[PDB]
């Protein structure tokens, strides 16, 4: 009863075609949906559905028996290994010494690589007399019999109890190795090794095998720290050692919240004199305690200076956008912005001052983009958003547009472009002039209204017309029906133009009609009227779509050569930068780039750059006067300050630019207060032990994510951005089952690690239904067991409208208290020293209290009373009450006011507080902290905390000695001052 051979034996009785559906039906679905609920998600298999149900029902009732058992499918036609060691010794040398019997000899001394593998050097000779000669491989078996491997996680969050392990490999066959393995000490984390003594231990490795030696460390400081293990063998002369770098990340999540963005322009705005502009400080009502914050002030001399400078540099082009790129339109970062950037620089003749050498680099970037984009192509030149999906009309037309715009820069194959135009015109355009879309919706303007969907055809047809407006003389001999398609599309747009209710449709349709010269009269009036405040085309509830609509409308205005309605639209488009200096989605950044770039077609009485921007920063001691001029290599200047303040900026002179004020801080792990346009629930539940896990894994758990759209229709494109907990990684088997099976629930996964905090897992969803919850679950494996784990984040957001989001956090929440790594040793007292002062082992006198209290840093000395205790899984909050200010600090506080002290979780057991007990506490002016509620004293290495026994219990033996000392302390700190 192996029940695997039964499964495969039953699979072997279906036709070879349409045979995968029974295989995927036999699979254990991790999101344990019944057969009839999985047959709802199967796409194209009509006979497959019945087959999927037949086999699913089968194996499911064969699983109802037998409570070692093997229940995995044995598949076929899959190659196993890749990632072989990188090649080296790639050089061209020649022989030019006198030959010996016609054979020249040259000796070349080389350095072997640090890899344990069998290299095989291949040689080829080319002689201009005796021709060519391919040599035999010279096999070099590089081997080492004692090799030490250090296993540490990807990143560890501060104050976590992780157990790294040093695996020792012994390949000696006749010898059982006795070796002394030692962990070196680093003051940046509490290890079993200190400065007082080493942590060296003697172990014995069996022959032809390994041994794992564990070390538990507690990171105390954020940054890249050195984990170094030394191994010295106890018999031979082999001494090996490993020194790896472990990065320790802060306790929250990184945020680059945009403080404000202000258009720097003294001529059209700022009236008399010149423009003054106040910039507020940041919110930071949730900044993680004891974390730094950096404010980057960015001065763009022109509206499109940073976007170009980033579009040229390779290792900076992907910083324009805060969302991943794993789909047909998203990948277009590799082309579009670099394309319009190079064109903007060509039209304005700026490569001379900027640097000619970079142009070709940009072109190579475009080449790479083009290469990447070719991966989404189907037969007959049709582009789908994801492989194994129906080709989309919108994406195909958009790729046509970008490619036809790119034929000027790099070599674009006319077969793909022309075949795509042919696919669009011939297959997707109906004699109605309407373009059909038989794929899932990508843009939320592609789905339109329901009972009347007239505008649904309007927006798509206008977009495809904009696409074909730039492939006029580029692709025509292959597809000669471009004037007729433009005719029919423009006719459908110009006929049903008075049926448009949304401002986006009006915008993009107006630009499509203006490109042909058909925007005039009632269409012109109707178009310009909808613009609210005559500087933005917007709809409530769709935020980035308003940036797109304003961009398309600006292109319509520049197409009509109208130079009156533009400056307000430029001022509005320049101040929509919400996610860093750039924008959220791809389409927003692209269209704003195109429009703001094409406002500088020529210089027809247009503003030339010569600004005199002075900034009075409170953190700095003097004014800061930046002067960016035209005909300068860098139209960009930036400064950085490590203190968050609200500074005043004063622009002057002639020139229109941008002031981007962005900060960087770490927010706490609290779930979203108000989730705008998304419902999201995340739960994590442990998996059974007997259920098999990978070998290196220690514990396996199930992660379940359930989301729902709150809109009137289904969401069009959604991202699940899951940041893993420390030491965790997803099970790629389940991800493969969900992304590639017949019952599809995931478009594709990524695991796109950008080297920021913990590694992320991006999941792509074609849609999120509003009629139900799109639950999906998968296994997560903990390869390093961690205690005091800080929770992980799961942020959902719509790709083309980032304000539709919901950020939730998940945690196992183990029961009633904290299980840490065994605290008996000094490894623990070391960790607990960090978060509150240390007492001399009950040898505490009031004279000592006076010393430590009369330190020059001691700003406040309070007598608190523990009112409330709200402890979380990342930071415990003690809502205290001041009963008497024995020494008030730099912050005014009244007797009886509450102050909420924050403490790290790792210190909870070290403090062991009880509610409604008196306490003596003191600290520094640095202990005060900026949050709201304005109750922020961080209990740190300088915060004295001691339980004050009440008057009724001073009649006990262990208390009176402390009571009298505390009273003498109080009066000796009120009546008598400090002499130090």
């Amino acid at each position, epitope marked *: 009863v192996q029940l695997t051979e039964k499964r495969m034996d039953k699979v072997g009785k279906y036709p070879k075609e349409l045979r995968k559906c029974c295989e995927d039906g036999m699979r254990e679905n991790p999101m344990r949906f019944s057969c009839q609920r999985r047959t709802r998600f199967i796409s194209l298999g009509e006979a497959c559905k019945k087959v999927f149900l037949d086999c699913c029902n089968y194996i499911t009732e064969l699983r109802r028996q037998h409570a070692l058992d093997e229940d995995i499918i044995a598949e076929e036609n899959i190659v196993s290994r890749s990632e072989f060691p990188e090649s080296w010794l790639w050089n061209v040398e020649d022989l030019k010494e006198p030959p010996k019997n016609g054979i020249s000899t040259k000796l070349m001394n080389i350095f072997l690589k640090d890899s344990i593998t069998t290299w095989e050097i291949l040689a080829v000779s080319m002689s201009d007399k005796k021709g060519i000669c391919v040599a035999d491989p010279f096999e070099v078996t590089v081997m080492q019999d004692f090799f030490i491997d250090l296993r540490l996680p990807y990143s560890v969050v501060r104050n976590e109890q992780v157990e790294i392990r040093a695996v020792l490999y012994n390949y000696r066959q006749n*010898q059982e190795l006795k070796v002394r393995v030692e962990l070196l000490h680093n003051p940046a984390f509490c290890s079993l090794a200190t400065t007082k003594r080493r942590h060296q231990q003697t172990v014995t490795i069996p022959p032809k095998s390994s041994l794992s030696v564990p070390y538990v460390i507690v990171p105390l400081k954020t940054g890249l720290q050195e984990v170094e293990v030394k191994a010295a063998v106890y018999h031979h*002369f*082999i001494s090996d050692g490993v020194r790896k770098s472990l990065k320790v990340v802060p306790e929250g999540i990184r945020m680059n919240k945009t403080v404000a963005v202000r258009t720097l322009d003294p001529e059209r705005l700022g009236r008399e004199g010149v423009q003054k502009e106040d910039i507020p400080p940041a919110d930071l009502s949730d900044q993680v305690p004891d974390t730094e914050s950096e404010t980057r002030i960015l001065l763009q001399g022109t509206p499109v200076a940073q976007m170009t400078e980033d579009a040229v540099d390779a290792e900076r082009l992907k910083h324009l956008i805060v969302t991943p790129s794993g789909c047909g339109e998203q990948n277009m970062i590799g082309m579009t912005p670099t394309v319009i950037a190079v064109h903007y620089l060509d039209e304005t003749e700026q490569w001379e001052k900027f640097g000619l050498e970079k142009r070709q680099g940009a072109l190579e970037l475009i080449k790479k983009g083009y290469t990447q984009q070719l991966a989404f192509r189907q037969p007959s030149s049709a582009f789908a958003a994801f492989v194994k999906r129906a080709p989309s009309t919108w994406l195909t037309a958009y790729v046509v547009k970008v490619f036809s715009l790119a034929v000027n820069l790099i070599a674009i194959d006319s077969q793909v472009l022309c075949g795509a135009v042919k696919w669009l015109i011939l297959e997707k355009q109906k004699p109605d002039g309407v373009f059909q879309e038989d794929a899932p919706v990508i843009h939320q303007e592609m789905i339109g209204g329901l009972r009347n969907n007239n505008e649904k055809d309007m927006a798509l047809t206008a977009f495809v017309l904009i696409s074909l407006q730039e492939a006029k003389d580029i692709c025509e001999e292959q597809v000669n029906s471009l004037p007729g398609s433009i005719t029919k599309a423009g006719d459908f747009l110009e006929a049903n133009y008075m049926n448009l209710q949304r401002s986006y449709t009006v915008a993009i349709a107006g630009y499509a009609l203006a490109q042909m010269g058909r925007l005039k009269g009632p269409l012109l009036n109707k178009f310009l009227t909808t613009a609210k405040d005559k500087n933005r085309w917007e709809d409530p509830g769709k935020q980035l779509y308003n940036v797109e609509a304003t961009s398309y409308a600006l292109l319509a205005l520049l197409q009509l050569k109208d130079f009156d309605f533009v400056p307000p639209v430029v001022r509005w488009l320049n101040e929509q930068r919400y996610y860093g200096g750039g924008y959220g989605s791809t389409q927003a950044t692209f269209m704003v780039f195109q429009a703001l770039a094409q406002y500088q077609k020529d210089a027809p009485d247009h503003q030339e750059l010569n600004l005199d921007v002075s900034l009075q920063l409170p953190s700095r001691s003097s004014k800061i006067t930046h002067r960016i001029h035209w005909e300068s290599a860098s139209l960009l200047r930036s400064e950085e300050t490590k203190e968050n303040e609200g500074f005043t900026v004063t622009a002057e002179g002639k020139g229109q630019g941008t002031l981007s004020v962005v900060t960087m801080y770490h927010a706490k792990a609290k779930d979203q207060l108000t989730c705008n346009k998304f419902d999201l629930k995340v739960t994590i539940k442990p998996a059974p032990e007997t259920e098999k896990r990978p070998q290196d894994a220690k514990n396996t758990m199930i992660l379940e994510i359930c989301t729902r759209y709150r809109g009137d229709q289904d969401a069009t494109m959604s991202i699940l951005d899951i940041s893993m907990m420390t030491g965790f990684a997803p099970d790629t088997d389940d991800l493969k089952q969900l992304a590639n099976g017949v019952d599809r629930y995931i478009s594709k996964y990524e695991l796109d690690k950008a080297f920021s905090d913990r590694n992320t897992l991006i999941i792509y969803l074609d849609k999120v239904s509003h009629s139900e919850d799109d639950c999906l679950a998968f296994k997560v494996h903990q390869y390093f067991n961690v205690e005091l784990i800080q929770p992980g984040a799961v942020k959902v957001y719509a790709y083309y409208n980032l304000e539709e989001s919901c950020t939730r956090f998940y945690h196992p929440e183990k029961e009633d208290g904290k299980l840490n790594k065994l605290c008996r040793d000094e490894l623990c007292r070391c960790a607990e020293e960090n978060c509150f002062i240390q007492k001399s082992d009950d040898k505490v006198t009031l004279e000592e209290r006076l010393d430590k209290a009369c330190e020059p840093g001691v700003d406040y000395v309070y007598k608190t009373r523990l009112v409330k205790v709200q402890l979380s899984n990342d930071f415990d909050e003690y809502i205290m009450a001041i009963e008497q200010t024995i020494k008030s600090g730099s912050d005014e506080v009244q007797v009886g006011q509450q102050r909420t002290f924050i403490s790290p979780i790792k210190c909870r057991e070290a403090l062991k507080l009880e509610e409604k007990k008196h306490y003596l506490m003191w600290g520094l002016s640095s202990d005060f902290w900026g949050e709201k509620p304005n109750l922020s004293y961080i209990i740190g290495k300088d915060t004295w905390v001691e339980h004050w026994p009440e008057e009724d219990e001073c009649q006990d033996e262990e208390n009176q000695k402390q009571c009298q000392d505390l009273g003498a302390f109080t009066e000796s700190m009120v009546v008598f001052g400090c002499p130090n």
Partner: nanobody
Amino acid sequence: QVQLVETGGGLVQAGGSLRLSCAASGSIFSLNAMGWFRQAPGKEREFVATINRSGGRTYYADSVKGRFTISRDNGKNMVYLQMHSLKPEDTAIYYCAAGTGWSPQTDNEYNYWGQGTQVTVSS
């Protein structure tokens, strides 16, 4: 790789002393084990002394436990074997051997050897 040339031997008095210098023709660093071996006529290839890559760890055979002292100067690429309190039974051909670092007391883990030098201790 490296080849070795031994010198400093010869004939010596019954209880005198002499130092054997082992010259290397390459790089002596990264050579974990550097060992002196002797072979007397009518004897198996036996072990004398080995020194670590930086010194400190020294292995000696019981027959020369306190009478001999092996040293090395990595800067000059030289290994030295000082022989104090000689015995007539020490008459042998003393070789200098480059090794791997594995099991230095045995002679199977030394892939490079020298020429040798004759030391005759007359009674």
